[PDB]
Write a protein that binds this ligand. Sequence first.
Ligand SMILES: [Ca+2]
Ligand SMILES: [Ca+2]
Length: 79
Amino acid sequence: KECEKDQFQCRNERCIPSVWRCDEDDDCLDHSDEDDCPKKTCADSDFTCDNGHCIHERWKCDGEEECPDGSDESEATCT
Ligand SMILES: [Ca+2]
Ligand SMILES: [Ca+2]
């Protein structure tokens, strides 16, 4: 059995909307839609821009705005 490309397949093989994957409610009844869910946020090793965009730490404060809000280059950010 294989679900639509817009679906998550539970271990019991129920299909759910993929939008229900990792939404912190067990829709599968086997909890499989909520297993091994990615970290909600950036890598701790990445710089998190103010707006939440993730960039690699190396590009923090190096003259070019890799953050869309430019917070990797802000006065505040670089001390
Ligand atoms: Ca869910
Ligand atoms: Ca930069």
